[PDB]
Design a protein around this ligand. Structure first.
Ligand SMILES: CCCCCCCCOCCOCCOCCOCCO
Ligand SMILES: CCCCCCCCOCCOCCOCCOCCO
Ligand SMILES: CCCCCCCCOCCOCCOCCOCCO
Ligand SMILES: CCCCCCCCOCCOCCOCCOCCO
Ligand SMILES: CCCCCCCCOCCOCCOCCOCCO
Ligand code: NA
Length: 656
C-alpha cells in the first residue's frame, strides 16, 4: 500500500530478487517517508538512512564518493540533472557489494532516483505550504486513467523561500513533469516522460575554515563566528540552473518468461553562477577579514543515454534462474566559459581599505551582503568543451538452488572515453594556450552473493564484488528479516571495502572502510511506524605516497551515524511524528587537518485530518535550532546547515 515505510522490491528491473533475498545492503526511501518528513530536497530525504555524507554536492556512501553512481530511473545521469522531490516516487540507496547499475569500476554504493509514473487510478493531490523561513510552496499531482490501457500524470511545483539562519540567502525553483503510459495489461508497454526544473538561488559556501598552523595536531575548523553569517553579495552572486529531460521506454513480452526493453533519454542542462568563496585561504580570516573570492560557471550540457535489456525466467535442471542482461551507451557534451571577474578595489589578495570600500572584502565577524560591489564581470577568454562516451554490458542472475539456498552472480564491463579541449589562461595547468586532453579506460566487475534462508522470511548472506582495470574489493556478511507478514524489515550487516585509488583527486595507495550497519523500517504495531538505521564506519588510509596520511581517517566519513524517524497514529484523526539524527565528526582531507564537529538534530511532525480530502501538516525541522555544518571541504570553507524551520501545509487529496 502507498503509505508503507517498508518497500519489499526495487523499482529497478535490474534486481533479480526481492530485497529480502538480495545479498547487499539496500534501503528504499519510500514516498510516504518523503511526505511525512516534509523533505523538500534530495539531501533532506537522504538523511533518513545512515552512512551518506556530501563533499566536492557529490554524495559519499560509506566513506566513498558516489557521484558517478547516481542514477535516474536506473540510467546514467548524463549532463548531471538537478532533481527535487516533487517528481520523485522513491529513492533507492544501495551500499552492499556489487551494483545493479553501470557505475564504471564501482564495487557498490549507488543512489537511484525513481521518478513518478502514471498509475491506473484517478487522483488529484494539491499542497500549499507556508514556512517560518518565508517558504511559499505549491504542488499539484494529477493522475488520470485513459481507458483500461493508458494513463497520464502531471506534476507541478513552485517554491520560494529564505534559508533559516543564513543571512540574505534565498532559493526559488519551479518544475513541470508530464508522463504518459501506453499499454497496461498488454504485451507491449511504453512510457513517455518529460521533466523540466528551473532554479534561481543565492549560492552559499558557508563559513571560512581557519588556516593558520594547519596540521593534524592543530586542525582547522570553521571560524567561531555567528552561524547566520553570509559572505556573498546580494548584488553579484547567483546560481541559475535549468534541467530538461525527455525519456522514451518501451518493453515487450516475447513470451510469459522473456521481456525485451529499450530506453532512451535526452537531456539538456544549463548552469550559470557566481558565488563567493569566503577568503579562499588568502590569509585575511586570521586578521578578521574575508575576501569575497568570486568563482563562476557558465555552462551548457547535452546528453543521451540508451539502454537495451533482456529479462528472463528459466530453468536449468532443478535450478531456477532469474536473469537480466543488457547494454548501455551514453554520450555527454559540456561547454563551459567562466566569467572574468575583476576587483573594484585594486589588485592583491590581502584586504585593505580600498577593497573593503569596493565590496570585494568584508568583516569576518559582521559581513554585510548588502554591500555595493564596484567590480566588473565579462565573458572570460578560457573555455572548455568536454565530450564523454560510455559503453557498458552486464549480466546478472539469481539462481535458486533449493528452497534454502540461492546464488547470485553478476558480470559487468564498462568503458569510458573522455575528451576535453579549449583555451586556458596562465596558471596551474601551464602557460596560456590551447589544450586537448583524452582519457580512455575500461573495467571488469564481478559479483557473487550466496544466500541462505533459515526460514521463508529470513536471509543470511555473504557477498563480494571486485573490479579490475587493465584490488578494489567489497565484502559483506549480512542478515535480513521480515516480520508481521512483511510489515517490518530488520537488517544487519558487517562489511569491509578496500580501494587502491579512491577519489576529483586520486590517491596512490590503499583505503579501507569496515564496519557495521543496522536498518529498520516498517510497522512496530498497527499505529507505530519506524524508519532508520545505524552505521559504524572504521575508515583508514592504509597506504599513501604521503607517509603522514597513513593511519588517518578518510575524509567525508563519520564514524557513527544514527537516524530514526517514527510516526504514531494517536487518534484516527491525528498523527504525530519525530526524528533524531546523530552524525559524528568529519574530516575534510586525508591529512585530517580540517574538520567539522558532530551534532544531534531533532525533528517533529503533526498531521490533522480536517476531512477525508484535506490534511493539515506541521513539520518542525531542527527543533532545537542546533547550528551545525553538513559539509566540510578539504580547504577554504564549511557549509552551514539551516537553523530551525516550521512548515505548515494544507494537503488536498481527491481520489476516484
Ligand atoms: C527571466 C526568466 C523567466 C522566469 C519566469 C518564467 C516562469 C515560467 O512559468 C512557468 C511555465 O509553466 C509551464 C507549465 O505549466
Ligand atoms: C537569466 C539571467 C542570468 C543572469 C542572472 C544574474 C543576475 C541574477 O538575477 C538578476 C536579477 O535579480 C533580480 C532579483 O533577484 C532576487 C533573488 O536573486 C537570487 C539570485 O538570482
Ligand atoms: C528518443 C528519446 C527522447 C524522446 C522523449 C519524448 C518525451 C515526450 O514526453 C511527453 C510526455 O507526455 C506529455 C503529455 O503532454 C503534457 C503536456 O503538459 C502540459 C502542461 O500543461
Ligand atoms: C547470458 C545472457 C543471455 C541468456 C538469455 C537466456 C534467456 C532465454 O530464456 C528463454 C525463456 O524461456 C522461453 C520459454 O520457451 C517456451 C515458451 O513457453 C511459453 C511461456 O509461457
Ligand atoms: C562465463 C561468463 C559469461 C556469463 C554468461 C551467462 C550465461 C547465462 O547463464 C545461463 C545458464 O545456462 C548454462 C547451463 O547451466 C547448466 C547448469 O546445470 C548443469 C548441472 O546439472
Ligand atoms: Na536575482
Amino acid at each position: 500500500d502507498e503509505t508503507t515505510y517498508n518497500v519489499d522490491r526495487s523499482a529497478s528491473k535490474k534486481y533479480t530478487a526481492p530485497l529480502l533475498d538480495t545479498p547487499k545492503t539496500v534501503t528504499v526511501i519510500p514516498q510516504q517517508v518523503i511526505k511525512d518528513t516534509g523533505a523538500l530536497t534530495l539531501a533532506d530525504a537522504l538523511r533518513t538512512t545512515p552512512g551518506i555524507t556530501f563533499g566536492a554536492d557529490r554524495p559519499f556512501i560509506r566513506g566513498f564518493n558516489a557521484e558517478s553512481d547516481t542514477f535516474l530511473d536506473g540510467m546514467r545521469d548524463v549532463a548531471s540533472q538537478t532533481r527535487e522531490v516533487f517528481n520523485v516516487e522513491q529513492i533507492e540507496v544501495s551500499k552492499g557489494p556489487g551494483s545493479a547499475y553501470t557505475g564504471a569500476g564501482s564495487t557498490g554504493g549507488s543512489l537511484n532516483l525513481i521518478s513518478k509514473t502514471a498509475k491506473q487510478d484517478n487522483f488529484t493531490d494539491a499542497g500549499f505550504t507556508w514556512g517560518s523561513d518565508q517558504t511559499r510552496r505549491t504542488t499539484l499531482d494529477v493522475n488520470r486513467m485513459i481507458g483500461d490501457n493508458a494513463a497520464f500524470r502531471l506534476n507541478l511545483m513552485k517554491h520560494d523561500a529564505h534559508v533559516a539562519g543564513r543571512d540574505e540567502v534565498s532559493v526559488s525553483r519551479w518544475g513541470v513533469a508530464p508522463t504518459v503510459t501506453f499499454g497496461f495489461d498488454t504485451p507491449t508497454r511504453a512510457t513517455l516522460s518529460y521533466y523540466h526544473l528551473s532554479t534561481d538561488d543565492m549560492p552559499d559556501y558557508g563559513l571560512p575554515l581557519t588556516n593558520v598552523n594547519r596540521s593534524k595536531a592543530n586542525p582547522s575548523k570553521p571560524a567561531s563566528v555567528d552561524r547566520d553569517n553570509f559572505y556573498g553579495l546580494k548584488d553579484r552572486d547567483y546560481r541559475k540552473s535549468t534541467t530538461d529531460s525527455g525519456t522514451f521506454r518501451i518493453e515487450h513480452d516475447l513470451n510469459d518468461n522473456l521481456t525485451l526493453s529499450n530506453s532512451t533519454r535526452l537531456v539538456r542542462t544549463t548552469l550559470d553562477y557566481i558565488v563567493s568563496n569566503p577568503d579562499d585561504s588568502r590569509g585575511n580570516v586570521a586578521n578578521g577579514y574575508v575576501y569575497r573570492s568570486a568563482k563562476s560557471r557558465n555552462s551548457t550540457s547535452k546528453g543521451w543515454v540508451n539502454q537495451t535489456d533482456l529479462k528472463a525466467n528459466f530453468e536449468t535442471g532443478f535450478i531456477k534462474h532469474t536473469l537480466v542482461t543488457g547494454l548501455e551507451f551514453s554520450y555527454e557534451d559540456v561547454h563551459n566559459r567562466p566569467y572574468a571577474i575583476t576587483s573594484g578595489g585594486g589588485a592583491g589578495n590581502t584586504c585593505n581599505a580600498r577593497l573593503l570600500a569596493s565590496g570585494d572584502c568584508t568583516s569576518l565577524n559582521r559581513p554585510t551582503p548588502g554591500d555595493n560591489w564596484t567590480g566588473s564581470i565579462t565573458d572570460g577568454l578560457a573555455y572548455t568543451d568536454t565530450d564523454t562516451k560510455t559503453s557498458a554490458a552486464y549480466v546478472f542472475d539469481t539462481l535458486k538452488l533449493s528452497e534454502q539456498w540461492e546464488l547470485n552472480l553478476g558480470l559487468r564491463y564498462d568503458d569510458f572515453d573522455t575528451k576535453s579541449s579549449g583555451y586556458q589562461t596562465a596558471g596551474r595547468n601551464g602557460p596560456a594556450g590551447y589544450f586537448k586532453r583524452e582519457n580512455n579506460s575500461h573495467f571488469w566487475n564481478y559479483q557473487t552473493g550466496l544466500v541462505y534462508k533459515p526460514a521463508p522470511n529470513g536471509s543470511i548472506y555473504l557477498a563480494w564484488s571486485t573490479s579490475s582495470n587493465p584490488r578494489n574489493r567489497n565484502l559483506e556478511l549480512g542478515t535480513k528479516w521480515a516480520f508481521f507478514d512483511d510489515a517490518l524489515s530488520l537488517n544487519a550487516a558487517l562489511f569491509r571495502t578496500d580501494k587502491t585509488n579512491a577519489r576529483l583527486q586520486v590517491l596512490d595507495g590503499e583505503q579501507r572502510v569496515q564496519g557495521v550497519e543496522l536498518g529498520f523500517n516498517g510497522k512496530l504495531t498497527e499505529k507505530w511506524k519506524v524508519f532508520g538505521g545505524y552505521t559504524y564506519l572504521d575508515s583508514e588510509i592504509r597506504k599513501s605516497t604521503v607517509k603522514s596520511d597513513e593511519g588517518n581517517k578518510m575524509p567525508q566519513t563519520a564514524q557513527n551515524n544514527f537516524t530514526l524517524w517514527t510516526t504514531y497514529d494517536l487518534l484516527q484523526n491525528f498523527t504525530i511524528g519525530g526524528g533524531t539524527t546523530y552524525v559524528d565528526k568529519q574530516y575534510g582531507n586525508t591529512a585530517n587537518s580540517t574538520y567539522i564537529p558532530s551534532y544531534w538534530r531533532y525533528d517533529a511532525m503533526a498531521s490533522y485530518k480536517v476531512s477525508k480530502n484535506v490534511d493539515l501538516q506541521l513539520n518542525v525541522q531542527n527543533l532545537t535550532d542546533k547550528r551545525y555544518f553538513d559539509q566540510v571541504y578539504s580547504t577554504h570553507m564549511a557549509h552551514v546547515a539551516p537553523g530551525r524551520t516550521a512548515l505548515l501545509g494544507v494537503n488536498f487529496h481527491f481520489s476516484a
